[PDB]
C-alpha cells in the first residue's frame, strides 16, 4: 500500500496528529498502514484505529441518511419526477461507504482477529466486525441482506460470549459492545424487546460492579452506562 514505505512508529505518530487535526480520512489511512505492518496493536493503537474509521464511516452514513430521506420523499404520491440524480448520488455515497466497511472488515480478517488472544483485543475486534457488518446492513436491500445481518449478529455474539466470561461487567469495551448489539437488535434485527432487555441487564450488572473501581475507572464505565440509560429512555 501507499504506507508501505513509512515506519510503523511514524504511522502511529501521524495518526495521532491527524486525530488532533480532525483529519479522520488521513488518520484511517495511517492506521491501515500500521495494521498492515503485521504486528499486533496495543490498546492505544486499537483505539486510534477504531476512532479513525468510526468517524469516516459516521460521516458517510449521515450523508447517506440525508440522501435516502430525499429519495424517499421523491418517491411519494404527488412528488414531481426529478430524474435519476438523487438515486445516483445516494448510490455513489453508498458504494463509497461499503468500500470503507469492506476495508475495515478486511483488516480485521487479515489478520487482526486471528492473532488476538487476550479478551481486550479479541472482543474489541469482534465488536468492530459486528459494527461494520451492521453498517453494511443499514444500506443492504438485496439477496445477501439476511446474510449480512447474520454476520453482524455472529460477530457480536462471539464478542458477547467472550466478554461475559473474561471481562468485568464495568469494562468499557464490554459496555460499548452491549450498547451497540442492543442497537443492532432494536433497529436491524426487528427485536426491540431483546434490545431493551440487553440494555437493562447490562446497565444493572455494571451498577453492581462499580464499587470495585478506582475513581478513574468509575468515570470511564459510568460514561457508557449513561448511553445505555439514554437508549432505554428513548425506547421506553
Amino acid at each position: 500500500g501507499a504506507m508501505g514505505s513509512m515506519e510503523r512508529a511514524s504511522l502511529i505518530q501521524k495518526a495521532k496528529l491527524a486525530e488532533q487535526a480532525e483529519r479522520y480520512e488521513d488518520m484511517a489511512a495511517f492506521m491501515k498502514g500500521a495494521v498492515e505492518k503485521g504486528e499486533e496493536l496495543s490498546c492505544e493503537e486499537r483505539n486510534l484505529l477504531s476512532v479513525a474509521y468510526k468517524n469516516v464511516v459516521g460521516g458517510q452514513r449521515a450523508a447517506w441518511r440525508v440522501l435516502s430521506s430525499i429519495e424517499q420523499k421523491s418517491n411519494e404520491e404527488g412528488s414531481e419526477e426529478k430524474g435519476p440524480e438523487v438515486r445516483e448520488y445516494r448510490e455513489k455515497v453508498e458504494t463509497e461507504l461499503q468500500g470503507v466497511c469492506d476495508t475495515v472488515l478486511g483488516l480485521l480478517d487479515s489478520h487482526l482477529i486471528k492473532e488476538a488472544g487476550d479478551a481486550e483485543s479479541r472482543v474489541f475486534y469482534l465488536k468492530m466486525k459486528g459494527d461494520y457488518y451492521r453498517y453494511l446492513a443499514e444500506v443492504a436491500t438485496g439477496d445477501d441482506k439476511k446474510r449480512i445481518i447474520d454476520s453482524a449478529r455472529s460477530a457480536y455474539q462471539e464478542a458477547m460470549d467472550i466478554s461475559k466470561k473474561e471481562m468485568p461487567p464495568t469494562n468499557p469495551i464490554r459496555l460499548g459492545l452491549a450498547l451497540n448489539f442492543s442497537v443492532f437488535h432494536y433497529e436491524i434485527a426487528n427485536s426491540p424487546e431483546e434490545a431493551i432487555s440487553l440494555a437493562k441487564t447490562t446497565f444493572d450488572e455494571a451498577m453492581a460492579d462499580l464499587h470495585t473501581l478506582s475513581e478513574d475507572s468509575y468515570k470511564d464505565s459510568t460514561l457508557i452506562m449513561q448511553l445505555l440509560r439514554d437508549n432505554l429512555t428513548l425506547w421506553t
Partner: peptide, 5 residues
C-alpha cells in the same frame, strides 16, 4: 438519536 459507541 439513539447512541452507539
Amino acid at each position: 438519536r439513539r447512541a452507539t459507541v
